[PDB]
């Protein structure tokens, strides 16, 4: 009777909010300090061990398509990329007349005219003298003027050579919230893209996330458990990309058989330009290998899960990209310090009706001048890497776009996408959510203050 | 028996200085036009003012010693050059120019104002030269020894403006930080300095347009029912005199020339927008002010000046005494095109013991300017397509005195602007910044229980 107002401090009440999360590097990455591109030297070291705290009898709503964590990640990584290019050389005087001729030393039928021997007049250490130099350039980096050739970037923007002392290895990074904020992780395994999460556990902050940039595929990502998960903002709408996750990873081997030597050319006082000197041995096209038995088995898992939403009678068929720029129609990634753009038409070619060393090869080319962030005016020239390169990756997902459209046909067409580069990072931040803590709360009870 | 008692939060303030942050509306933020003044980075303003009418309080004010105008002058200059870094700098434009007069449809009044210059220019390739031509005004070219060169070549590298950003002034609001307050005086009769019987406090100042002009105040706040004349020393001639109009006068400015922009492609990713041929007739830019309205506001101004100089003296108006084009002309911008108008036709009259004529003023256009009286800086305005027509209203004057050699019978007033700091005093004269001091001690008959 006559219950009075009582205020409690430190009550566990939270709601959604926005904040600027900070980095948290590992102990190993905080000791080498070998001038990483992502400026991990400034990043604070992380906690010695995870401090996950499980919450019982809690229900929380999640939304991976409107989460602001990916926007912060997307905004940051661009700034980190730009910051690492300022203190190294700028290739402003390379825009000059080029006389390029084909190389026919030990070429292959595939590499008929993929390499050009270009010679040009470049400035020496002295401003009053110019020395004739030569280099090898890929066809994708030279455009004919009318013979006479010139770099593609000359008429759009002059940009910086990729710095030679910096590395592009995607070391894991941890995104962590400041005081007064908490991160909630959804431990449910059937969480598709939205809904209450039966098991929500708060954590100190997110786990290691590798900033891998790829298109049409997800490389070195996270693996689902005992299920294949398909996530989309709106399955009915065909304009929304479809995200797939693999429980069992499939391995892809990519290599460059060509052996080339790096040659340094002095373009001015204190500035050096590294160019491909010569190729030792035969010249062959680069390619990637994917096991047919594993890929076909993985595709069988995908269609079974994908057939649930569109009907168990629907016929599933796959096709290559619908056309467009080289950045979207091909699979883009890096292996060391060289960037690939590979034709994956040999993977998405099947038709499903639903009643061991083939090593599917994906021949492809290599480009040196790249606009990674799909922005006009900021390119980069990656210097050649000495010797052959080899690397293996984990294919942990796909980005598929459905192009059915017509309602008069039962069969549905799925094609690889990759138009937006936020999808690669959204597939790893979907579990986490950011909330703020409000310690002030008022509850009624029986308590009085002495006069 | 009196004992010390302490109170926290008493309304006591003292004069001080602090850094004030910006406040802007959502009009420019939604459009995303990337203005020179970054409203997106600027803090959004309050939905409505929260002024409080204070009673029984008298506070001193001083616009001449006000520190707010110092911060506004520094901030605007800092914002001006912050937008010039991205776009191209015309470092290779210092070459030999072969210029010749144009005589197609030139009127005698503009016989030699603009030339036709041709010169070699660089391209993306560092081994090719292109021969192009552009039209430059006479004020921007000087004979080196025909051969001509830009005035900035022996001064500094001359950077041009970014075409995307616009120079149209937009209102801004100044807000005191936490723990500080701003006091506003609502007394209409309040002159430059003195106690204010009515004082009010606001969290953010009213919208202020950073219009830059000389000898004339354009698009500014007006007085109430009278014409206010403010000067830190009316007797001293060296101090400028500020005038505020109760009723504005409209001025029409236009550039009849119809020039075509030509984007000359130089360097990788760089662009130089030169002036092409003018189609049709070529005539000078001019500005009109109504003679009936202008003569009416002079009669109000002279009456106010009689109070501070006797009701029997003779007030005379004269044009600028002398100097360069910057200080002897009404400098302003109009739709991205800068103007330097000759205002000798306004201040030509005498008053003793007391029909749309549309007074026209010849004006000139300059491309290379020094915005803030600095040396070694440029802002090369790109040409604008079509004809430019902007309508503005004058809300004040800046005047200076001279002579006074013990002859108290005639007074001469001439236009003159020392700097743009006095330009913004007419808008910041009613605002001052004070800091709150919550702590206080008072005597009361009370103790502490032990």
């Amino acid at each position, epitope marked *: 009777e006559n219950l009075w107002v009582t205020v409690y401090y430190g009550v566990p009440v939270w709601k959604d909010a926005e904040t600027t999360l900070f980095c948290a590097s590992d102990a190993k990455a905080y000791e080498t300090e070998k001038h990483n591109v992502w400026a991990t030297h400034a990043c604070v070291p992380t906690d010695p061990n995870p401090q996950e705290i499980h919450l019982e009898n809690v229900t929380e709503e999640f939304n991976m398509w409107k989460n602001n964590m990916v926007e912060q990640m997307h905004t940051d990584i661009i700034s980190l990329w730009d910051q690492s290019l300022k203190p190294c050389v700028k290739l402003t005087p390379l825009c000059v007349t080029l006389q390029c001729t084909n190389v026919t030393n030990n070429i292959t039928d595939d590499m008929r005219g993929e390499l050009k021997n270009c010679s040009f007049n470049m400035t020496t250490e002295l401003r*009053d*003298k110019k020395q004739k130099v030569y280099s090898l350039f890929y066809r994708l980096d030279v455009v004919q003027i009318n013979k006479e050739y010139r770099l593609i970037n000359c008429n759009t923007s002059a940009c910086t050579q990729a710095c030679p002392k910096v590395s592009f290895e995607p070391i894991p990074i941890h995104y962590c919230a400041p005081a007064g904020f908490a991160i909630l992780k959804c431990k449910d395994k059937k969480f598709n893209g939205t809904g209450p999460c039966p098991s929500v556990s708060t954590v100190q902050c997110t786990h290691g996330i590798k900033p891998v940039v790829s298109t049409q595929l997800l490389l070195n990502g996270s693996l689902a458990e005992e299920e294949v998960m398909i996530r989309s903002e709106n399955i009915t709408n065909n304009a929304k990309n479809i995200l797939v996750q693999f429980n069992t990873p499939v391995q892809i081997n990519c290599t460059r058989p060509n052996n080339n030597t790096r040659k340094s050319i002095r373009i001015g006082p204190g500035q050096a330009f590294y160019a491909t000197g010569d190729i030792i041995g035969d010249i062959r096209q680069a390619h990637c290998n994917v096991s047919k038995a594993t890929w076909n088995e993985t595709l069988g898992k995908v269609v079974k899960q994908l057939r649930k939403h569109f009907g168990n009678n629907t016929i599933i068929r796959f096709a290559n990209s619908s056309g467009g720029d080289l950045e979207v129609t091909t699979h883009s990634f890096n292996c060391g310090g060289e960037f690939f753009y590979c034709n994956t038409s040999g993977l998405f070619n099947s038709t499903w009706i639903s009643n061991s060393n083939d090593s599917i090869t994906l021949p492809c080319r290599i480009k040196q001048i790249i606009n990674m962030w799909q922005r006009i005016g900021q390119c980069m020239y990656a210097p050649p890497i000495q010797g052959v390169i080899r690397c293996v990756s984990n294919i942990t997902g796909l980005i598929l776009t459905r192009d059915g459209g017509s309602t008069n046909s039962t069969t549905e067409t799925f094609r690889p996408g990759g138009g937006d580069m936020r999808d690669n990072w959204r597939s790893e931040l979907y579990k986490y959510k950011v909330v703020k803590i409000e310690p002030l709360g008022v509850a009624p009870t029986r308590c009085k203050r002495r006069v | 028996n009196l004992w010390v008692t302490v109170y926290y939060g008493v309304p006591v303030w003292k004069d001080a200085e602090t850094t004030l942050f910006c406040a802007s509306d959502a009009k420019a933020y939604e459009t995303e036009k990337h203005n020179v003044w970054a409203t997106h980075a600027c803090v959004p303003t309050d939905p409505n003012p929260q002024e409080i009418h204070l009673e029984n309080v008298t506070e001193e004010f001083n616009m001449w010693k006000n520190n707010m105008v110092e911060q506004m002058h520094t901030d605007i200059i800092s914002l001006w050059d912050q937008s010039l870094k991205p776009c191209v700098k015309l470092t290779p434009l210092c070459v030999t120019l072969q210029c010749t007069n144009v005589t197609n449809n030139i009127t005698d009044d503009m016989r030699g104002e603009l030339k036709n210059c041709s010169f070699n220019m660089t391209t993306e390739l560092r081994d090719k030269k292109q021969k192009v031509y552009s039209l430059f005004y006479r004020l921007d070219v000087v004979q080196i020894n025909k051969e001509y060169r830009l005035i900035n070549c022996n001064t500094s590298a001359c950077t041009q403006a970014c075409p995307k950003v616009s120079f149209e002034p937009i209102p801004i609001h100044y807000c005191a930080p936490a723990g500080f307050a701003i006091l506003k005086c609502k007394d209409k009769k309040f002159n430059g300095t003195g106690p204010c019987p009515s004082v009010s406090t606001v969290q953010c100042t009213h919208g202020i347009k950073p219009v830059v002009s000389t000898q004339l105040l354009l698009n500014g706040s007006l007085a109430e029912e009278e014409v206010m004349i403010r000067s830190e020393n009316i007797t001293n001639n060296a101090k400028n005199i500020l005038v505020q109009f109760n009723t504005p006068v409209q001025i029409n400015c236009t550039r009849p020339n119809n020039n075509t922009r030509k984007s000359i492609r130089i360097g990788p990713g760089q662009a130089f927008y030169a002036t092409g041929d003018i189609i049709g007739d070529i005539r000078q830019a001019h500005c009109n002010v109504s003679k009936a309205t202008w003569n009416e506001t002079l009669g109000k101004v002279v009456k106010q000046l009689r109070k501070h100089f006797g009701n029997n003296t003779i007030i005379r108006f004269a044009n600028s005494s002398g100097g360069d084009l910057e200080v002897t002309t009404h400098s302003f911008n109009c739709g991205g095109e800068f103007f330097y108008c000759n205002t000798s036709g306004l201040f030509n009259s005498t008053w003793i013991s007391n029909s749309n004529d549309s007074i026209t003023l010849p004006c000139r256009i300059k491309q290379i300017i020094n915005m803030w009286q600095r040396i070694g800086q440029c802002m090369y305005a790109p040409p604008i397509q079509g004809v430019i027509r902007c309508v503005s209203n004058i809300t004040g004057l800046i005047l200076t005195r001279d002579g006074g050699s013990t002859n108290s019978t005639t007074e001469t007033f001439r236009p003159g602007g020392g700097d743009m700091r006095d330009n913004w005093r007419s808008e910041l004269y009613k605002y001052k910044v004070v800091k709150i001091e919550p702590l206080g001690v008072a005597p009361t008959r009370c103790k502490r229980r032990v």
Partner: antibody
Amino acid sequence: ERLVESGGGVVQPGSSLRLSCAASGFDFSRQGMHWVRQAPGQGLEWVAFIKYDGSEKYHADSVWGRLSISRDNSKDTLYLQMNSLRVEDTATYFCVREAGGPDYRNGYNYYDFDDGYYNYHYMDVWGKGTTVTVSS
Amino acid sequence: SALTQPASVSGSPGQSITISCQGTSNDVGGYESVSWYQQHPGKAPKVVIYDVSKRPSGVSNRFSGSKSGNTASLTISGLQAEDEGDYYCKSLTSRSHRVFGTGTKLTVL
């Protein structure tokens, strides 16, 4: 700024011989050299030309595939090799330098590969030469 | 194809003489690279014309040369005793080879 030729002698037809030319006082690695032979009562005859780095070699049609020419910038010497000499092959061979210099365009000096010299298409300095005769 | 030259040219001192040296239009008039040389017994030949029509440093200014279409000639004004000797004309070929002319013998009266 001086060239000396040596290696003359008397050989039977069908034999082989080599002539050596040396350069001093100037850069041997930047300018190309020629080979000319003359006989009493006969005009000058051009034999061959070699570039500064020996990228390509030019030989006269009348002696095509007869005389082999090579140079060694490290040793600062020039070599002239001929095989199966004939009775008419006797002459006075001279080691001759071709003058060259940077090309001047747009205000700058344009050199060749590895800081080479563009030929100016005239001969300035000539060697004293050596006389050789063939007898059976 | 060797250049064709007159067998001999004679001229008294103080007069003006002309020497003809002709080959193929492509070889001579094509590459524009024409040179002239002067030789003395017991001495190597010395270049007398630096360019196709320009003299080098360290030579008398009396020498002069000209070209007219396919035809080119050398003119010497004010002949002297020291002008006696052998003269040759050299030019590049179409295939960047060097060809020597037949040669002309000069007789001083």
